[PDB]
Design a protein around this motif. Structure first.
Motif, mmCIF file in Angstrom:
data_model
loop_
_atom_site.group_PDB
_atom_site.id
_atom_site.type_symbol
_atom_site.label_atom_id
_atom_site.label_comp_id
_atom_site.label_asym_id
_atom_site.label_seq_id
_atom_site.Cartn_x
_atom_site.Cartn_y
_atom_site.Cartn_z
ATOM 1 N N UNK A 127 9.639 -7.094 7.209
ATOM 2 C CA UNK A 127 8.144 -7.408 7.166
ATOM 3 C C UNK A 127 7.601 -7.423 8.440
ATOM 4 N N UNK A 153 -1.004 -8.817 3.325
ATOM 5 C CA UNK A 153 0.466 -8.113 3.438
ATOM 6 C C UNK A 153 1.450 -8.195 2.370
ATOM 7 N N UNK A 154 1.746 -7.130 1.661
ATOM 8 C CA UNK A 154 2.653 -7.071 0.616
ATOM 9 C C UNK A 154 3.871 -6.127 0.737
ATOM 10 N N UNK A 155 5.150 -6.585 0.297
ATOM 11 C CA UNK A 155 6.209 -5.850 0.611
ATOM 12 C C UNK A 155 7.050 -5.783 -0.584
ATOM 13 N N UNK A 156 7.698 -4.455 -0.899
ATOM 14 C CA UNK A 156 8.614 -4.541 -2.106
ATOM 15 C C UNK A 156 9.727 -4.106 -1.231
ATOM 16 N N UNK A 157 11.159 -4.703 -1.529
ATOM 17 C CA UNK A 157 12.156 -4.330 -0.954
ATOM 18 C C UNK A 157 13.183 -3.544 -2.023
#
Lengths: 163, 164
Positions: free
Chosen positions: B62, B91-95
């Motif tokens: 991130x 702030x958006x995160x896909x793992x």
């Protein structure tokens, strides 16, 4: 096994951070309190700072994402479940700057959800759960209150997987 | 007034900025790998950014993506000699998969139309918002965000610039 109490499992998490996550050590991320229902992580501002002398957004994210990861870990420890834990998603909205000590607050999901979640892991060897964390600036908050507006909101999803 | 800055000139400014202002970037070993005006690539070694499984910790992932997009916005603003404060707003995160070695976060410049509207809105109002995407791959050869190689991580970020 012999680690079920909030102090006993907090020590495990503190150890986990110190053993495995060098970034949490640079940030000075510590457990402020855990009573079985609410986890609060704290970190000093100085290593987490940016050019405007407020908290770098990535450090606010890290505190929140580790607060919720932390809450899942503490639950797995209380349940004496051996597993791998992963974040599968994390979402942050930054509403206002944070310009002091960072304090990220995560509340446990209810017992029914936790029970369903541990049930699912037993049956399939995989299970997922969503959690939320908040960070406040103006107030020395002990709980994510319906009243108070947070400076940052986080919502994440976490998975536990069979060894 | 100055002429607009070339990709080399502004890239130096962002290098200096991380160094002067973001102690976390020095801990992480975060560096600009390249910037050509259209694409910013940031890199960081695995060792400071590692987790219990010997892969990249999701928080460091991130940080690299959030800074790659913040970096892109700062580069466009500087190229244009705009004096402003710049904050992330979301702030958006896909793992999707583990990152197993060196971390490379790739961000592209928003559309020329988008940039134009963003600087115009800032000029007229003293504030403006823009969103960008970043992706992180394991593959060493990847130089852009592309359909043909699924990323280990995807990130969407929104940023605001403010009159100072």
């Amino acid at each position: 096994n012999a680690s079920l109490t909030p102090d006993q499992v907090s020590k495990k998490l503190k150890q986990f951070f110190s053993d495995h996550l060098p970034i949490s050590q640079f940030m000075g991320l510590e457990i402020e309190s855990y009573d079985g229902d609410t986890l609060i992580l704290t970190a000093p501002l100085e290593p987490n700072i940016n050019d405007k002398q407020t908290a770098f957004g990535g450090s606010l994210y890290n505190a929140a994402v580790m607060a919720c990861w932390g809450m899942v870990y503490l639950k797995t420890q209380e349940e004496n479940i051996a597993c791998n834990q992963v974040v599968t998603e994390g979402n942050m909205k930054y509403i206002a700057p944070v310009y002091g000590r960072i304090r990220a607050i995560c509340h446990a999901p209810d017992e029914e959800e936790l029970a369903n979640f541990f049930d699912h892991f037993e049956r399939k060897g995989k299970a997922r759960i969503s959690l939320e964390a908040a960070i406040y600036n103006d107030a020395c908050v002990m709980k994510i209150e319906p009243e108070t507006k947070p400076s940052v909101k986080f919502n994440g999803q976490y998975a536990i997987l069979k060894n």
